Amino acid sequence: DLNTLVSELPEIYQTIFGHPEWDGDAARDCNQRLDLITEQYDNLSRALGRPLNVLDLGCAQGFFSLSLASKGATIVGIDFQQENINVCRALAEENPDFAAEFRVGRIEEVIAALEEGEFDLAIGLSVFHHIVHLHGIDEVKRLLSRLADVTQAVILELAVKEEPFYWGVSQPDDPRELIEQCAFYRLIGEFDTHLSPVPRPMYLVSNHRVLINDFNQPFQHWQNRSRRYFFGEDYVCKFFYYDMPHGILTAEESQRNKYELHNEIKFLTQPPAGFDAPAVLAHGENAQSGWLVMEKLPGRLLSDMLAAGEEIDREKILGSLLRSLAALEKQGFWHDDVRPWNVMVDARQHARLIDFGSIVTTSWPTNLVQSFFVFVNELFNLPQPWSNWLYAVWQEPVERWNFVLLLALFEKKAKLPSAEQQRGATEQWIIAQET
Amino acid sequence: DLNTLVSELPEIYQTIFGHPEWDGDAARDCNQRLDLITEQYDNLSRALGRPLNVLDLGCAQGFFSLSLASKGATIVGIDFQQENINVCRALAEENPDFAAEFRVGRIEEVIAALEEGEFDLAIGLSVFHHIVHLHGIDEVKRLLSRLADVTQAVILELAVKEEPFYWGVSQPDDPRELIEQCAFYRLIGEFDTHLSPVPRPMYLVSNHRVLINDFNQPFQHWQNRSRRYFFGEDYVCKFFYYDMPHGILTAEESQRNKYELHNEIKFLTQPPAGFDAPAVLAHGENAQSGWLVMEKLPGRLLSDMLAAGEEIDREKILGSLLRSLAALEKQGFWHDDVRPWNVMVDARQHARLIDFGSIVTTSWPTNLVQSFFVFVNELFNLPQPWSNWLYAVWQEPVERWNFVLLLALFEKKAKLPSAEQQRGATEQWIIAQET
Ligand SMILES: C[S@@+](CC[C@H](N)C(=O)[O-])C[C@H]1O[C@@H](n2cnc3c(N)ncnc32)[C@H](O)[C@@H]1O
Ligand SMILES: C[S@@+](CC[C@H](N)C(=O)[O-])C[C@H]1O[C@@H](n2cnc3c(N)ncnc32)[C@H](O)[C@@H]1O
Ligand SMILES: O=c1cc(N2CCOCC2)oc2c(-c3ccccc3)cccc12
Ligand SMILES: O=c1cc(N2CCOCC2)oc2c(-c3ccccc3)cccc12
Ligand SMILES: [Cl-]
Ligand SMILES: [Cl-]
């Protein structure tokens, strides 16, 4: 009988599915977490085009398991207390069409035994802090990595050290230390536990997909540490953290990240005429982070080609870059931050800027022209006619320095007088000194 | 200069690729391991239809890395000694067309950072016992799982506790404890280390593919513990361990496994006329283990349907089973071991045997007829006309008991006299008592 199985629960942690006579007794009503979890279930189910297999770790009285089985999910619920599992099976028996199984088992053993592809979605709500408390942080991170490795998505609600209880003392400094080794993660909500005023963050995590409410796609590789890049078949997703764990970002740096991304979004959604910019496939910002999905460009980053000493055509790289810098300038745009790590080189040795967070609209623009000289020097130090080019620019009154001029003198550099035949000289040492 | 970089190696562990003037100095010549590794490289490359990305953990002086890059592999070699990496890069520079990178790093960090799909093949030869010695066995198993999770194949040479040195004392009882949580593994050789007379086993391991020299295919799930089953799109691979770790198998049990598989192979490659048997796609046996790849049958195992109390038609299950048992018997074959875990039931409620290791060719066959009664009882205890069927058989002189008779009385059971109208009686209690 259910009355008996319920009374024997050491704790009525969750709502008893379909049995509201216990809602007043449940530690946690579960409706807020459920609303968020069903939404993420729908997203991933829509993306995969089918009902999902769901794993529920530390599933307690089965509420999220049954509730998802109710929407047509196939669920396995795991808990290490026999009493919790007894209630789960009795509830599944009241719902014989739900495809729902429950097992007494330890989460550590189950994760060691999972096979990639068995489950699309795993949920682990308020369970891992127990494992943290007994096995430590490193083991939990490896468990969580493997859980992300073998599913499409993981949803975690994580207890935090700010909670007032003795076990809080064993928690990482920040719940993100448990998951930051995973590829993709995004805070999706914050929940009241009824134990204290400190809420628990809920995270959506994946080692296989970009899971953004608007764009749900596998990626095949990813790279960095408060910016992440996910590479899919024809996209790059640029993911910025504003809110970072630990001392990582200063107020200042969070705000630059935010500003740079907002700015990249604004530039790319309304590019200037005369400039070829990557198409924007999706974008969004929230308190913790912001993201931008773009069409993916071919080639390698210039910094890589220089580090991994691969062969480069500096004429073609400089000319193509300068041509775009001049086109930009004609429309009243400039790039603050022209560096080898911001430039991509395609197979035909043509270059383009890739980080548009540093695009600005307002002795301008002499400072930028100046650092471009440095850029040129790092790119190589200067042989003729490159040195002749720089020397001609140095002879210009300063109010004439701009990118149209830089480009025009670059295109005629073979006809310009020989710098080493003049005094000359100076400008050599100035640029060399910044570098 | 290479002479210098070599002299600074704390140890010339491997042959210096392309530099035989040091072969006399190398701790290990590497040619035996290399021959085996190139063969496995070729197999997997042939199966994937392309050159492989290879990860070499604790790559020392780069010998296996360079040797594979030489066959067109893209390789990354990792070692935590700067001196080893210095030599690796100098050797790669003598071979500028090899696609080869080397990094100073710790194996633990690198594996935490791997992404599924980056590397097809990882090799870890004589390196993990160092990590065992510092971090313990559980951490090493999780590292090895993740390494299998993110590649197609892993090749490991593992030090063993029988080696005479002090660190042997920290090793697992059996090197297989490091990998047995991985899905697929197969001993492919045994190597002399020149430290002692104890050789080191080399294992081929995968969490994604069945890697058998003749059959190299992804599988999508697997199941058990000295027999493993891998399920691919249209195959089941049945993998038997003869040689198990620890006390697991007795001499007796290894020999039964061997005999049962050999026997399954012999039956299936020459089935009797009149019996529909699964087609054999590949097979092989060696000292440690044996394997059989078969076409995959649809349905569920009868034991599962009974445990997970799913609905069954006992008429159709019994008749179809009996019909095959009678056909078998007509050709002079019997099955020793007719149990619910050896029977599969398709969607039309038709049943077939699946474990043919218990097929025999020689008061026969009364004992088998007897246990079939038990089978029938477990399947259900007997209502009429099932009980009437058994009662008729019990009335037969014993020399007449066989499967043709069992089938013939089963088909007429609705016409047979009512058992409960006779004495009757006995046979009820006999069968009930074995069960
Ligand atoms: C705080 S409750 C959370 C229950 C449920 N996940 C929820 O949030 O609604 C933690 C649950 O995990 C179970 N549990 C704790 N550690 C476990 C482990 N190592 N393996 C399996 N279950 C565990 C407990 O039995 C308890 O039901
Ligand atoms: C015994 S040697 C084996 C070398 C090579 N794998 C072979 O079998 O030919 C072990 C190698 O692993 C390196 N090594 C040991 N522990 C390591 C770790 N934790 N991370 C990276 N390299 C390590 C050592 O520098 C040494 O080169
Ligand atoms: O469109 C892009 C294509 C790439 N390439 C595509 C092939 O993989 C190498 C990187 O990278 C981009 C990056 C980037 C970020 C980190 C490292 C390298 C590149 C930033 C913004 C846009 C792109
Ligand atoms: O052809 C076969 C199909 C199956 N089925 C196919 C679908 O997955 C469930 C098992 O299983 C087989 C097994 C088996 C082994 C362990 C568990 C269950 C079945 C043994 C021998 C042959 C088959
Ligand atoms: Cl938690
Ligand atoms: Cl080892």
UniProtKB/Swiss-Prot annotation, chains A, B:
GO terms for biological process: methylation; O antigen biosynthetic process. S-adenosyl-L-methionine binds at residues 13-14, 33, 58, 79-84, 105-108, 125. Its EC number is 2.1.1.294, 2.7.1.181. It comes from the Bacteria. GO terms for molecular function: ATP binding; methyltransferase activity; protein kinase activity. It is a peripheral membrane protein. Pathway: Bacterial outer membrane biogenesis; LPS O-antigen biosynthesis. Residues 208-423 are annotated as: Kinase. Keywords: ATP-binding, Cell inner membrane, Cell membrane, Coiled coil, Kinase, Lipopolysaccharide biosynthesis, Membrane, Methyltransferase, Nucleotide-binding, S-adenosyl-L-methionine, Transferase. Its main location: membrane. GO terms for cellular component: plasma membrane. Disulfide bonds: none annotated. It is found in: Cell inner membrane. Residues 1-207 are annotated as: Methyltransferase. It catalyses: 3-O-phospho-alpha-D-Man-(1->2)-alpha-D-Man-(1->2)-[alpha-D-Man-(1->3)-alpha-D-Man-(1->3)-alpha-D-Man-(1->2)-alpha-D-Man-(1->2)](n)-alpha-D-Man-(1->3)-alpha-D-Man-(1->3)-alpha-D-Man-(1->3)-alpha-D-GlcNAc-di-trans,octa-cis-undecaprenyl diphosphate + S-adenosyl-L-methionine = 3-O-methylphospho-alpha-D-Man-(1->2)-alpha-D-Man-(1->2)-[alpha-D-Man-(1->3)-alpha-D-Man-(1->3)-alpha-D-Man-(1->2)-alpha-D-Man-(1->2)](n)-alpha-D-Man-(1->3)-alpha-D-Man-(1->3)-alpha-D-Man-(1->3)-alpha-D-GlcNAc-di-trans,octa-cis-undecaprenyl diphosphate + S-adenosyl-L-homocysteine; alpha-D-Man-(1->2)-alpha-D-Man-(1->2)-[alpha-D-Man-(1->3)-alpha-D-Man-(1->3)-alpha-D-Man-(1->2)-alpha-D-Man-(1->2)](n)-alpha-D-Man-(1->3)-alpha-D-Man-(1->3)-alpha-D-Man-(1->3)-alpha-D-GlcNAc-di-trans,octa-cis-undecaprenyl diphosphate + ATP = 3-O-phospho-alpha-D-Man-(1->2)-alpha-D-Man-(1->2)-[alpha-D-Man-(1->3)-alpha-D-Man-(1->3)-alpha-D-Man-(1->2)-alpha-D-Man-(1->2)](n)-alpha-D-Man-(1->3)-alpha-D-Man-(1->3)-alpha-D-Man-(1->3)-alpha-D-GlcNAc-di-trans,octa-cis-undecaprenyl diphosphate + ADP + H(+). ATP binds at residues 227-229, 238, 260, 295-297, 344, 355. Belongs to the WbdD family. Regulates the length of the LPS O-antigen polysaccharide chain. Stops the polymerization of the chain by phosphorylating and then methylating the phosphate on the terminal sugar. This terminal modification is essential for export of the O-antigen across the inner membrane. WbdD is also required for correct localization of the WbdA mannosyltransferase. Interacts with WbdA. This is O-antigen chain terminator bifunctional methyltransferase/kinase WbdD. The chain holds residues 4 to 471 of 708 of the full protein.
